[PDB]
Design a protein around this ligand. Structure first.
Ligand SMILES: OC[C@H]1O[C@H](O[C@H]2[C@H](O)[C@@H](O)[C@@H](O)O[C@@H]2CO)[C@H](O)[C@@H](O)[C@@H]1O
Length: 467
């Protein structure tokens, strides 16, 4: 499926993919091996879909938080660099790409969000979130606004949720406790409430996304944005005299961004693993290779010691690391996918008014901790106890809810439907839905009765967890 004798690379559309293609051109000139760089939409979801069957790119780039899930799924080749190469990168960046004792990617660069501000509109940026409402009032009187940033991805709101105490998974005695989630504690609620209050008081708009915020800052319409180093080169080309600085404090506490390590993994199905390693170690992870990417879109604080010694003198990188040091490196555990999905739903629902802050975060807390368990019940006590005839009928009844074509209704197995069903009906909702759909099927009445019992069992187990 994957073509032998060339390299296909996937990297996100906000990174320096034209600079990476230039590294690939040098590789081709030395070796004759052509290197194609692509930036597919929804890359972090598309890779595990195609790689599951042995398709996809030779090399996948993403922040390290997704890579434990990919490795658990067997989608990644183990990385075994010689000690001489391993010593060229900072040890903590190798930690970010180690999963169950195995290196599963090459670390490239350390990313953290900073406060970016327009020095002509705002010579002295605010030290606190709490000052921003008054600043917005003052700027609105000049036809401007104080702050716009992407409110569709929870990555950008996390620094504020985490500031007063919110967390993802508790790190306890050397490992993450996948049952101890910190998204509905008092600190998380306080931060999300402040965000929702900014929207209620017309200092931000719930529909603001990456493109809208970037355009508004780079056109000089808003005084501040929150973004990572990849954003700097577009501001450079704009007319904005900008600075990069520490994020504002909340309730006197630093904002705590999730720190990501841009990482490159090798597809377990690649027939080009030797070439992919040669490209990543000896073409990309060099001063000249990282510079080629960095001049396109800045990487942040790179993992390669020799080149970071040059970048560290840049005040923008100093600000990036100051923010990174106030935050936490993301876990790479497989549960991160469910965490991000739950938190994305909570922030969007709270910002839009669809849910209160308390209700939105309570659901995200339960579902980040318990989605896997509800899915196990749905699969093993629901779908695997019904025959193919009834499974086909249930897929037909779910066709509108899950968007299933006739071919999808034909090809999708019980594991896939379980995944899709819980994405649509999060947590306990997926059990309720199957119970509702199978209430009236005569041959499934026994199956349905036990699902009610299973639903009750986990409800008890969920409470014993919280107290
Ligand atoms: O919003 C949740 C999202 O956050 C992170 O994605 C970041 C990425 O790390 C940055 O490099 C940049 O591209 O922005 C993304 C947010 O739009 C996580 O890495 C990702 O897994 C998670 O879904």
């Amino acid at each position: 499926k994957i073509e032998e004798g060339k390299l296909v690379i996937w990297i996100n559309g906000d990174k320096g993919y034209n600079g990476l293609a230039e590294v690939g051109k040098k590789f081709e000139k030395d070796t004759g091996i052509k290197v194609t760089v692509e930036h597919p939409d929804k890359l972090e979801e598309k890779f595990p879909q195609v790689a599951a069957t042995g398709d996809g790119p030779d090399i996948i780039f993403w922040a390290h938080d997704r890579f434990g899930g990919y490795a658990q799924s067997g989608l990644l080749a183990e990385i075994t660099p010689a000690a001489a190469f391993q010593d060229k990168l900072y040890p903590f960046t190798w930690d970010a790409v180690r999963y169950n004792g195995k290196l599963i990617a090459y670390p490239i660069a350390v990313e953290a969000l900073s406060l970016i501000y327009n020095k002509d509109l705002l010579p002295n940026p605010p030290k606190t979130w709490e000052e921003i409402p008054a600043l917005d009032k003052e700027l609105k009187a000049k036809g401007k606004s104080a702050l716009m940033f992407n409110l569709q991805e929870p990555y950008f709101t996390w620094p504020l949720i985490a500031a007063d105490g919110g967390y993802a998974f508790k790190y306890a005695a050397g490992k993450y406790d996948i049952k101890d989630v910190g998204v509905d504690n008092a600190g998380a609620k306080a931060g999300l409430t402040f965000l929702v209050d900014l929207i209620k008081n017309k200092h931000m708009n719930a529909d603001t996304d990456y493109s809208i915020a970037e355009a508004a800052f780079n056109k000089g319409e808003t005084a501040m944005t929150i973004n990572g180093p990849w954003a700097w080169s577009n501001i450079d080309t704009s007319a904005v005299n900008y600075g990069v600085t520490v994020l504002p404090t909340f309730k006197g506490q630093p904002s705590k961004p999730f720190v990501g390590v841009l990482s490159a993994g090798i597809n377990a199905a690649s027939p080009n693993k030797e070439l992919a390693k040669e490209f990543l170690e000896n073409y990309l992870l060099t001063d000249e290779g990282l510079e080629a990417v960095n001049k396109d879109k800045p990487l942040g604080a790179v993992a390669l010691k020799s080149y970071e010694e040059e970048l560290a003198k840049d005040p923008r990188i100093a600000a990036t690391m100051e923010n990174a040091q106030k935050g936490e490196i993301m876990p790479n555990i497989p549960q991160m996918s469910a965490f991000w999905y739950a938190v994305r739903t909570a922030v969007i629902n709270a910002a839009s008014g669809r849910q209160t802050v308390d209700a939105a975060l309570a659901a995200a807390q339960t579902n980040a901790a318990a989605a896997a368990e509800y899915k196990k019940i749905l699969l093993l006590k629901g779908f695997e106890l019904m025959d193919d005839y009834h499974f086909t009928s249930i897929k037909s009844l779910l066709a509108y809810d899950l968007g299933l074509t006739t071919k999808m209704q034909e090809e999708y197995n019980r594991i896939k439907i379980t995944d899709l069903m819980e994405k649509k009906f999060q947590g306990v909702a997926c059990l309720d839905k199957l119970i509702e759909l199978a209430k009236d099927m005569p041959s499934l009445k026994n199956l349905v009765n036990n699902l009610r019992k299973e639903k009750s069992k986990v409800a008890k187990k969920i409470k014993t967890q919280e107290k």
